[PDB]
Design a protein around this motif. Sequence first.
Motif, mmCIF file in Angstrom:
data_model
loop_
_atom_site.group_PDB
_atom_site.id
_atom_site.type_symbol
_atom_site.label_atom_id
_atom_site.label_comp_id
_atom_site.label_asym_id
_atom_site.label_seq_id
_atom_site.Cartn_x
_atom_site.Cartn_y
_atom_site.Cartn_z
ATOM 1 N N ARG A 43 -66.537 11.741 -15.569
ATOM 2 C CA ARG A 43 -65.462 11.530 -14.603
ATOM 3 C C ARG A 43 -64.226 12.275 -15.088
ATOM 4 O O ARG A 43 -63.524 11.817 -15.993
ATOM 5 C CB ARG A 43 -65.186 10.041 -14.428
ATOM 6 N N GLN B 77 -59.531 11.766 -9.096
ATOM 7 C CA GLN B 77 -60.555 12.059 -10.088
ATOM 8 C C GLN B 77 -61.759 12.691 -9.406
ATOM 9 O O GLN B 77 -62.111 12.323 -8.282
ATOM 10 C CB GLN B 77 -60.977 10.790 -10.841
ATOM 11 N N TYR C 225 -65.845 14.063 -10.231
ATOM 12 C CA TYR C 225 -66.974 14.077 -11.148
ATOM 13 C C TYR C 225 -67.361 15.517 -11.491
ATOM 14 O O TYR C 225 -66.750 16.486 -11.033
ATOM 15 C CB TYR C 225 -68.156 13.321 -10.544
ATOM 16 N N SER D 48 -72.594 11.582 -14.579
ATOM 17 C CA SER D 48 -72.124 12.639 -15.466
ATOM 18 C C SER D 48 -70.814 12.242 -16.133
ATOM 19 O O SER D 48 -70.739 11.201 -16.795
ATOM 20 C CB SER D 48 -71.955 13.948 -14.691
ATOM 21 N N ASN E 153 -70.809 16.746 -8.832
ATOM 22 C CA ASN E 153 -70.813 15.892 -7.641
ATOM 23 C C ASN E 153 -71.810 14.743 -7.783
ATOM 24 O O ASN E 153 -72.476 14.351 -6.823
ATOM 25 C CB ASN E 153 -71.096 16.705 -6.376
ATOM 26 N N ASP E 154 -71.913 14.198 -8.994
ATOM 27 C CA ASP E 154 -72.821 13.096 -9.277
ATOM 28 C C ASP E 154 -72.115 12.077 -10.157
ATOM 29 O O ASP E 154 -71.325 12.441 -11.032
ATOM 30 C CB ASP E 154 -74.103 13.587 -9.962
ATOM 31 N N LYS E 155 -72.403 10.799 -9.917
ATOM 32 C CA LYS E 155 -71.797 9.717 -10.681
ATOM 33 C C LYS E 155 -72.472 9.486 -12.027
ATOM 34 O O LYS E 155 -72.007 8.637 -12.795
ATOM 35 C CB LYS E 155 -71.822 8.423 -9.863
#
Lengths: 95, 239, 158, 14
Positions: C14, C3, C5, C12, C8-10
């Motif tokens: 998945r 998986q 994102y 947002s 490249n940020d958590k």
Amino acid sequence: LTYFSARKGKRKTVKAVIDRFLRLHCGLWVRRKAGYKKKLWKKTPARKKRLREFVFCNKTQSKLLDKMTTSFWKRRNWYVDDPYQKYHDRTNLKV
Amino acid sequence: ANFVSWKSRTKYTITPVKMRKSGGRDHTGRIRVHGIGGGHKQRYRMIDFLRFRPEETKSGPFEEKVIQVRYDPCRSADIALVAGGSRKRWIIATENMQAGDTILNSNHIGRMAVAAREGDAHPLGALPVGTLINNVESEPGRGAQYIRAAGTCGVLLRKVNGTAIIQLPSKRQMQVLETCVATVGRVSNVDHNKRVIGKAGRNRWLGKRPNSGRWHRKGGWAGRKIRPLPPMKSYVKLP
Amino acid sequence: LGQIYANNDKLSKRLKKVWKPQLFEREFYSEILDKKFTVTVTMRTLDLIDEAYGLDFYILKASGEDLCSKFGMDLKRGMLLRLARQDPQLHPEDPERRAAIYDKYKEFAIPEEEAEWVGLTLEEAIEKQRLLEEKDPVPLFKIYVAELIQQLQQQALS
Amino acid sequence: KKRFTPPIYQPKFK
RNA sequence: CCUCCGCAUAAGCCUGCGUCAGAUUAAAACACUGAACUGACAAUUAACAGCCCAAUAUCUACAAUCAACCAACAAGUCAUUAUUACCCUCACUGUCAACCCAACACAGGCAUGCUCAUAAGGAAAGGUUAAAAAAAGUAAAAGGAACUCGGCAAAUCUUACCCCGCCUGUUUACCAAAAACAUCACCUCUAGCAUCACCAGUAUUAGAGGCACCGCCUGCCCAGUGACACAUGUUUAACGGCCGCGGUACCCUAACCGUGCAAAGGUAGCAUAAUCACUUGUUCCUUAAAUAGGGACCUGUAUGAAUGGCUCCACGAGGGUUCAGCUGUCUCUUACUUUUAACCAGUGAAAUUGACCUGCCCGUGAAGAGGCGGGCAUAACACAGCAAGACGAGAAGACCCUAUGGAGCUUUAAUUUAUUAAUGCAAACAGUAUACCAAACCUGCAUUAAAAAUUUCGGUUGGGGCGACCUCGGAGCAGAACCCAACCUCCGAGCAGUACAUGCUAAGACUUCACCAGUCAAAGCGAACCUCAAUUGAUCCA
RNA sequence: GCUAAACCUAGCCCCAAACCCACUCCACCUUACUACCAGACAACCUUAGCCAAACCAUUUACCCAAAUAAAGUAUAGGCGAUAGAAAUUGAAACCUGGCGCAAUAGAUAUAGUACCGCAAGGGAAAGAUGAAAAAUUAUAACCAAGCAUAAUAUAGCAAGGACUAACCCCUAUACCUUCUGCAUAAUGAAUUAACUAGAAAUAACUUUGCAAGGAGAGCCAAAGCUAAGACCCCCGAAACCAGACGAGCUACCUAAGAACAGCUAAAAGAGCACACCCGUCUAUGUAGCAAAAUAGUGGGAAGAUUUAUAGGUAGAGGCGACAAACCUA
Ligand SMILES: [Mg+2]
Ligand SMILES: [Mg+2]
Ligand SMILES: [Mg+2]
Ligand SMILES: [Mg+2]
Ligand SMILES: [Mg+2]
Ligand SMILES: [Mg+2]
Ligand SMILES: [Mg+2]
Ligand SMILES: [Mg+2]
Ligand SMILES: [Mg+2]
Ligand SMILES: [Mg+2]
Ligand SMILES: [Mg+2]
Ligand SMILES: [Mg+2]
Ligand SMILES: [Mg+2]
Ligand SMILES: [Mg+2]
Ligand SMILES: [Mg+2]
Ligand SMILES: [Mg+2]
Ligand SMILES: [Mg+2]
Ligand SMILES: [Mg+2]
Ligand SMILES: [Mg+2]
Ligand SMILES: [Mg+2]
Ligand SMILES: [Mg+2]
Ligand SMILES: [Mg+2]
Ligand SMILES: [Mg+2]
Ligand SMILES: [Mg+2]
Ligand SMILES: [Mg+2]
Ligand SMILES: [Mg+2]
Ligand SMILES: [Mg+2]
Ligand SMILES: [Mg+2]
Ligand SMILES: [Mg+2]
Ligand SMILES: [Mg+2]
Ligand SMILES: [Mg+2]
Ligand SMILES: [Mg+2]
Ligand SMILES: [Mg+2]
Ligand SMILES: [Mg+2]
Ligand SMILES: [Mg+2]
Ligand SMILES: [Mg+2]
Ligand SMILES: [Mg+2]
Ligand SMILES: [Mg+2]
Ligand SMILES: [Mg+2]
Ligand SMILES: [Mg+2]
Ligand SMILES: [Mg+2]
Ligand SMILES: [Mg+2]
Ligand SMILES: [Mg+2]
Ligand SMILES: [Mg+2]
Ligand SMILES: [Mg+2]
Ligand SMILES: [Mg+2]
Ligand SMILES: [Mg+2]
Ligand SMILES: [Mg+2]
Ligand SMILES: [Mg+2]
């Protein structure tokens, strides 16, 4: 705060309470007044000095912070250079 | 979904082969093309679109003879079985082709232009400039694919050195090799656009379901597009 | 099958992304088997072959947990059998080439009784063991006459 | 809408 | 007496009104004994339809409709040849019935042949009397729609007018069957084309869309969206739009001019209409009596030219009116028969029930009392009819409101392109005199049009939306310690005019009714000798 | 005294131990319960979702390696509701029961039987005399809800005070609840018998024991430590995903068939009209014949018509002459 976990079945604590407060062995929690580092140009120096003081909590707040923690945070630590060592024991108490 | 195609005959014959209707059903079974379904039963005729073809132990030109002009329900134009030699194959009929006619299927390209009739076929290298042709090919020895409907015809434009630009009915230019065999004249069964339907019974007999009753709002593609002529597509492979 | 994102940020969305390796249909030449095979090789395999100085070395040095393929194990088993059985690889009239090939790959030499069970799966091993332990049932008449002649010899020689 | 409930049949043992 | 039935074939569990004993008990809506049974006895024997075809190559264009005239279009339901090998032969499945699918012995449904009523087959009635009410049948002194919103069962047999839709048809299976969807005519866009539907087709073709024939016609626009060219443009029968004021001789309805905007400032046609309220419009006719119907007018400021505008040949279980003749709908109902009604014989419910020894009036109460106060009323018990009440029975109301409980639709509300086609970069191949060319097929990064993997839609609102507000201070309500609200009536504030000791510590208090917050200050080291009323922002993170 | 009440055994749940099994002959992959003939294609794939954070888009033990203290510590986490180790001393082989029950309990089970749909699937009560039923005897009766034995006798929430006697005399507005206020004409109720609803941590209270130490390793401690007692409900929705099933009614398509008297037949997707396809209206019933019927007035009935057989299109969908209509009431 999860009274019963799924692996150990013990009691868990809240790390925010540990990172934002400091419990003494006598039964008092040391906190910090909010807003002591933001917008210091519109505040009088008296307010700036008042915000930079270790203020104690109340009764219900201390009870809540104790219920949010377990028996590990209610012990007595003997650090080598503890600046709060003289505040652990509380003398001259008459009910 | 046991969907098997009815095109199971690897040998050319004359007997009409029975065909199965589809109604917009592929191999899965879902309707993918709307407007097809429910029509009168028809029989398929193996139509030979390749004009010039040598027989067994043959190589030179051969003569033919038109016998009888019939009708093909699988297309708009009519077909006509033309006999010749020791075999009979179905070919597309042309305008003013009746019984007792004689057509030629030659291939030797000549130095000058051959003033052929509107029934025989000759390569594009021997036809004069400005001649109504039909059933033009794309590759030498491939088969006629373009301009095969009813009354459709193309006119030769110009010649360079080994190509031949053919004007398509859509006013679009298209060149092809000089060694391509194409028929001369117009296809029979003219005045097809005047066929008044009159009632939905004819459309139901032909096998066309009515359109969808949903009111679709026209987007941005419903306007008139005044566009220039697209460039001429070339089929000649150059190294 | 992992998986990834969004930016490249958590904080947002998945999403799921599956990477695919690159395939280059090349052609190799095995010296032990003397036959060319068309294998859709990648890049890391070519790098390992170049580092191992040939294809036979890369096949014989890498263990079963490195090939991750059945054809590799089959090639390894074939090379082991060819090196163990000492079978004529090429042809007579020139044994020096075969001798040099056998001397080049001499730091292994797995015995014959152990090279036949290299790369085989569980079902193939069970099938091979059943075929080796087949043996049609011998008629009991031979055993009976053998016991009878043994008994008569024992009662006569005494 | 057209609300309607289907009846339920008891087993044939009572 | 009926036959709108029956006999066979097709589909279907297969023994389901033949005999024997029990028939004391058990299922017949009651009986005999038997279409709602226990055990034993054996039916059906094929010739009926199936159970099928030894291969290698090759052959099969002149329908059916009495098929012989003629005439077509929807272009069509039936056939063999040469060679090789093969002379053993009649096995198998059912032949019953009163029968299937719907919980049933149900006024439901079922494909073809046979005489369309006969040679098949069955009984509307258990008896007693003729209560009321209801349903199904014949007609009636006079009027024939005068009763009803409307010709609503009914029988005579019925003409003309208007709207809508070209017509046949179809759609909401189970409250709307229509003006609703479709149909030929027309118009717009896309595609240079061989194997799996499209199509064994070729720009008189195919796919994607809007109205829906024939007659008069479709006048304008790319400022905004999309599409096509990337030439700044084309497209509207693609999304949509076609003014206002002033001066205007006697009166509404103007010729003409000026002004600002913009693509044009309503073209033709038609109508107070299926057409916003004014609108029961001027007026003629149909009735003696007419917001019902037809005819000539648009201030229609909200009709309008394929979201197409109107007559016209034919038609409509679509929506309205009427003429000559007739039907008890009524004045004013009536004469008879059946179902049914009342009693006798038995099987025998469903909803519903806190218990009832259960009358009326006035007044009271959670605001509509048979059970409370004061009066009136009173031997007890069944049958036969009506509804005034017991806010009577069926559905935790489908209408109004709440829910940080859901779902459907559409996006220019939020995370993102996860899957295409176009792109630029990197690896992968090969020629090429310090430069260019990047082909067919795989991999990763970022973008553009279609899909989408998920979600929510704040609060008071004298019921909800609309009206008004979302923080704090002051003046009266709250008058002399303190606190107190309103969608009670008014001023305001999100700052400022000047020096940075507007430095560091440290007793004691008030505290916006809790907390988070805010404010005053003894004294010391350090230095020369702060004004206003609200005047504002915490956790995390950077 | 009729109706009807109790009579214990098939066993049922978890422990310790032990590793548990699968052809008498025939038939079983096509229409399984079928003896016999010519294309060999058939698996190798992040699970998802609900809930919680009062929404929710990051996140939320479930991952199958024995205890414990470390430790709920460092850490991860719109740094917040939550999740969570490791390094480390360590972990005594062998013994046959129920301070559980007895048919509304305990497995649903005498059984995965009847019954429902084509289909996956859902799925329930059963059996009581006795040593001798080869003792068909005379007894063992007595209790709930329903009945006769043995109906009513004026007046009244059915009750109390009472007298020599049922009524007659006076007083007195059923039960639990959301509610300030309910018998109110608000909610639940016909009874009897069986069953059903307060499960638990840190911090607190009391009582033994030891004591500057307590505690059966780990933890706490400026009078503490250990142990015991004491405590925190049930049932009721619309929604979402994953694995399998359906076009035998109905929408569409495919291959081979059948149906339509008679008259006018203008040549006709012509008219009336049998059988047939659908149902505009009246009357009957809404626990009916029927979970959608009965006669005519109805439209079509030589074709855009109906029908017997077989196959295919199914939910992030099928189909659609577009009713958000249908996909087994
Ligand atoms: Mg069309
Ligand atoms: Mg349409
Ligand atoms: Mg028979
Ligand atoms: Mg039924
Ligand atoms: Mg008879
Ligand atoms: Mg009778
Ligand atoms: Mg009777
Ligand atoms: Mg009369
Ligand atoms: Mg009237
Ligand atoms: Mg009538
Ligand atoms: Mg119509
Ligand atoms: Mg309906
Ligand atoms: Mg219908
Ligand atoms: Mg209807
Ligand atoms: Mg229409
Ligand atoms: Mg126009
Ligand atoms: Mg109006
Ligand atoms: Mg009238
Ligand atoms: Mg019609
Ligand atoms: Mg009776
Ligand atoms: Mg009261
Ligand atoms: Mg009253
Ligand atoms: Mg009452
Ligand atoms: Mg309610
Ligand atoms: Mg709320
Ligand atoms: Mg919600
Ligand atoms: Mg939710
Ligand atoms: Mg949903
Ligand atoms: Mg609100
Ligand atoms: Mg209001
Ligand atoms: Mg305070
Ligand atoms: Mg001072
Ligand atoms: Mg939640
Ligand atoms: Mg460890
Ligand atoms: Mg049980
Ligand atoms: Mg049970
Ligand atoms: Mg009793
Ligand atoms: Mg009294
Ligand atoms: Mg109680
Ligand atoms: Mg309530
Ligand atoms: Mg109330
Ligand atoms: Mg009540
Ligand atoms: Mg209520
Ligand atoms: Mg009740
Ligand atoms: Mg079907
Ligand atoms: Mg249809
Ligand atoms: Mg007709
Ligand atoms: Mg007709
Ligand atoms: Mg619609």
